[PDB]
């Protein structure tokens, strides 16, 4: 339609339009770490495509934890299980295809060190309510109260801040009036150079509809949101003697 360019990484291929407004995270590209490094050069650098999600009128939002969402995704999860220390940067394509008779809007951020607040105050959160790997955890619109669960409410985003003030992090706005897709590139952000990839969550993808999905009395009641993530410049510790 509009000079579609076809990116091929590994043995996977995805299609992208010519404009491609790419947001680099903090102006910094993911590079290698300039006691030895061992990198899996490209056998883990391919597009990993999650399931499409369900955006009705009343859908309040979704979040994914990295890299906990790719623990069942082939050689990246293999290198999570065999090695002990890890380091990677990411590239996130978020497409949301809809007709011109639909209306809505979405914030797509990436939040480093998003420490979640529990529903009951002085209790403990299970891991199944923080992260899930596959199909995401959904926000709520009201004050939720479940046993050992994150406080799910959109207007505080589980962190205690105003949800309108989440535009300080690397974001785009998917407006179905004009935009169709958002693309965020995220470097490695931690205080240590390599941390364990099962205990520490690096960041959190968040997709929140500010203007809700809204349409006619005869159109499709339901549009999907396709999430595609691809690591860049990953490496681990490696086992030798020397």
């Amino acid at each position: 339609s509009d000079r579609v360019r076809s990116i091929t990484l590994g043995n996977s291929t995805i299609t992208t339009q010519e404009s491609a407004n790419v947001v680099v995270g903090y102006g910094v590209w993911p590079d290698y770490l300039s006691d030895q490094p061992t990198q899996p050069d490209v056998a883990t650098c391919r597009f990993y495509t999650l399931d499409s999600v369900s955006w009705m009128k009343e859908s309040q939002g979704w979040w994914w934890k990295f890299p906990d969402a790719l623990r069942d995704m082939g050689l990246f999860g293999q290198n999570m299980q065999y090695h002990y220390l890890g380091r990677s940067g990411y590239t996130i394509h978020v497409q949301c295809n809809a007709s011109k008779f639909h209306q809505g809007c979405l914030l797509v951020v990436c939040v480093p060190e998003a420490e979640m607040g529990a529903a009951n105050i002085n209790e403990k959160i299970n891991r199944e309510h923080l992260s899930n790997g596959e199909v995401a955890n959904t926000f709520s619109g009201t004050k939720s109260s479940n046993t050992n669960d994150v406080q799910q409410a959109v207007f505080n985003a589980g962190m205690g801040v105003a949800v309108g003030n989440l535009t300080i992090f690397p974001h785009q706005w998917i407006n179905l009036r004009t935009n169709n897709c958002a693309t965020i590139v995220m470097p490695y952000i931690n205080s240590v150079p390599m941390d364990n990839m099962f205990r520490h969550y690096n960041f959190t993808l968040m997709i929140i509809p500010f203007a809700k999905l809204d349409y006619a009395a005869g159109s499709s009641t339901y549009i999907p949101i396709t999430v595609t993530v691809a690591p860049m410049c990953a490496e681990y510790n490696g086992l030798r003697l020397g």
Binding site: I121, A153, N156, S191, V192, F198, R199, H200
Partner: protein
């Protein structure tokens, strides 16, 4: 048009009383003759918010101790006590811990102390950046050791140390309690990856947990009119 007071150091490098330490010089309960403080940045709510503008921080520390003494009432207020000496011992991350006023760990070598006599200028000692990693974390999305065991959001790595306080002199004949005030001034501040301020109030000093507050103050209408 200056923007020299919106600097990170002109915003965070200011002194603030963070904790009050009460201890006596003559008791029967052997733990009210001393007190301690585990050094963090999560007790003054003002400074906790001003450091939770940023995720990673990196600063030196300058502590000034304001030490005052008032004698407890008894039969024997008529006394001539000589001037008191206080000890302020610093325990680095990985140091021993005293368990009484007469414990041996007040006498150990690699725990730096300060001895101050009543009447002088208040003491002062600088504390450098003493983390293993490159910066402290205000926020930590993970477990410390062996996930789903251990507390969520702990970060073992950013401990700074702790202090201990006792009167160096022997037990006097009248009870005299001493309260010290701790002025914690961070220095040479560098901050990274900013983030929005907190909207909700605080409930504990060891987690981010909260009750959901509103977004703002509600109006009566949406369109404005005249006075």
């Amino acid at each position: 048009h200056v923007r020299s007071e919106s600097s990170v150091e002109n915003f965070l490098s200011r002194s603030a009383c963070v904790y009050i330490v009460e201890y006596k010089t003559r008791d029967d309960t052997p733990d009210k003759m001393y007190d301690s403080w585990v050094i963090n940045t999560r007790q003054v709510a003002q400074l906790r918010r001003k450091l939770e503008f940023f995720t990673y921080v990196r600063f030196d520390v300058e502590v000034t101790f304001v030490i005052t003494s008032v004698q407890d009432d008894s039969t024997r207020q008529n006394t001539d006590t000589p001037a008191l000496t206080h000890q302020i011992m610093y325990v680095p991350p990985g140091g021993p811990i005293p368990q009484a006023v007469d414990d041996y760990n007040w006498q150990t070598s690699t725990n730096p102390s300060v001895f101050w006599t009543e009447g002088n200028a208040p003491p002062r000692m600088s504390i450098p950046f003493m983390s293993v990693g490159n910066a402290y974390s205000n926020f930590y999305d993970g477990w410390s050791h062996f996930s789903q065991t251990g507390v969520y959001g702990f970060n073992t790595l950013n401990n700074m140390g702790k202090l201990y306080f006792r009167h160096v002199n022997d037990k006097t004949i009248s009870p005299i309690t001493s309260k010290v005030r701790i002025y914690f001034k961070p220095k040479h501040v560098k901050a990274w990856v900013p983030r929005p301020p907190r909207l909700c109030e605080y409930t504990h000093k060891d987690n981010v947990d909260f009750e959901p507050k509103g977004v703002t103050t509600s109006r009566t209408q949406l369109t404005i009119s005249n006075s």
